[PDB]
Design an enzyme around this catalytic site. Structure first.
Site, PDB file in Angstrom:
ATOM      1  CG  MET A  27       7.136  85.637  -0.125  1.00 52.27           C
ATOM      2  SD  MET A  27       7.008  85.733  -1.916  1.00 52.27           S
ATOM      3  CE  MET A  27       7.807  87.301  -2.238  1.00 52.27           C
ATOM      4  CG  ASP A  28      13.279  85.682   5.895  1.00 56.27           C
ATOM      5  OD1 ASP A  28      14.259  85.695   5.101  1.00 56.27           O
ATOM      6  OD2 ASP A  28      13.407  85.871   7.135  1.00 56.27           O
ATOM      7  N   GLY A  29      13.742  83.243   4.119  1.00 55.44           N
ATOM      8  CA  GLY A  29      14.453  81.966   4.283  1.00 55.44           C
ATOM      9  C   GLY A  29      15.086  81.428   3.009  1.00 55.44           C
ATOM     10  CB  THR A  45       8.478  81.198   5.130  1.00 59.90           C
ATOM     11  OG1 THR A  45       8.908  82.250   4.246  1.00 59.90           O
ATOM     12  CG2 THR A  45       7.169  80.657   4.636  1.00 59.90           C
TER      13      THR A  45
END
Ligand SMILES: CC(C)=CCSP(=O)(O)OP(=O)(O)O
Lengths: 223, 227
Positions: B15-17, B180
């Protein structure tokens, strides 16, 4: 900003030949000449290590005719690499291989062991599970002979016990269009950047390698 | 295109960004991180409807301790919202990772969230919290070494099946991994468990990740299904 260690999943050889209307054996005959070409190119770019996936622990499940062909074909390692200037190591379970292939492999490693340029690690009858399992067994044995305590078991110890050694791949390239690692270097790929291409391995060229590296550099700048 | 009859059983999520999303709106990083669990819950609701059985979400890695102390403290405090987000949601929640190195209140909150949702019969959400692939393999190995020295197993019992049972993230392994934020690495997430997982990477930042992006990942996964 050149990656020192590139990992390669050399997929697409069978598909390459079938799509061309060639016998599957013709795709496989390009495997080592192509890998050798990739080594030369990478050597000139300053790349220090290549780890190439050639035969998984699962590929024994393929048609016996293809597996026999492959096992015979892998004996050409020595001619391909003995006088190439590359330092060659094989990782994986060597004792399942035909004895003549085992001899051929030992001969190639022995004759190239003093080469100072690019280190080519070929994964043959290799799987990431099996790398991790042999390391674990080794750690258990040492614990059972009083040579280590449970507090000694850490990342560094695994790094020493695994077949594919530090430094780990900076970049992994997989040809053939699928986006999986297929039980290749599981522990070692923890921070490796992945690059997937639909290009089949026998079509993979200098321009394809440069695109992968450029893509790595951009991603390295971002992350 | 979306084949109702071939949903992945298990999706893993990186769950990046969230931080970069904040900077793009001019906002403080805290504002980005506060969309994490609300977005995760939305992803769970969409996934339940499609028939997905398990999601493993990478919330905090063993290497994320090395970040700014301000950002670390904020996250740990924020992870307490896990109870409010999920306790009444119908989702069954589990945490994996080293729980004893988290602050005490978070440890009791985790335990409470797990206990209050353990009867739920729907989607199982596994939140990886102070977890890492190296960590999971090392803790499994320490457990196998303990049993070996106490005569409870022999070196030759050590095999893939045994290892599957000692790891924290269990079978069935992820069918599909979605990350992501645009980076194309696994960043020491579920290493052993990702051996055959299909990878899907998107530049979409986690707070902008929606139902279409998820269905796009799944169609892609369905198109590459073999064996
Ligand atoms: C050995 C190489 C280059 C790729 C793996 S082929 P695959 O993706 O079908 O995985 P398997 O080894 O066949 O299980």
């Amino acid at each position: 900003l050149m990656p020192k260690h590139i990992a390669l999943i050399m997929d697409g050889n069978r598909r390459w030949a079938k799509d061309k209307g060639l016998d599957v054996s013709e795709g496989y005959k390009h495997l080592f000449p192509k890998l050798k070409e990739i080594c030369d190119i990478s050597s000139k770019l300053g790349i220090q290590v290549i780890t190439a996936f050639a035969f998984s622990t699962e590929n024994w499940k393929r048609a016996k005719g293809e597996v026999d062909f492959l096992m015979q074909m892998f004996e050409e390692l020595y001619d391909e690499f003995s006088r190439s200037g590359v330092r060659v190591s094989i990782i994986g379970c060597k004792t399942d291989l035909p004895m003549t292939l085992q001899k051929c492999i030992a001969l190639t490693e022995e004759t190239t062991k003093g080469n100072k340029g690019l280190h080519l690690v070929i994964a043959l009858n290799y799987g990431g599970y099996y790398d991790i399992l042999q390391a674990t067994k080794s750690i258990v044995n040492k614990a059972m002979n009083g040579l280590l305590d449970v507090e000694d078991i850490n990342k560094n110890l695994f790094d020493q016990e695994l077949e594919s050694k530090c430094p780990n791949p900076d970049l992994l390239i997989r040809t053939g269009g699928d986006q999986r690692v297929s039980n290749f270097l599981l522990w070692q790929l923890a921070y490796t950047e992945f690059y997937f291409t639909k290009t089949l391995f026998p079509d993979f060229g200098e321009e394809d390698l440069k695109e992968a590296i450029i893509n790595f550099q951009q991603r390295h700048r971002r992350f």
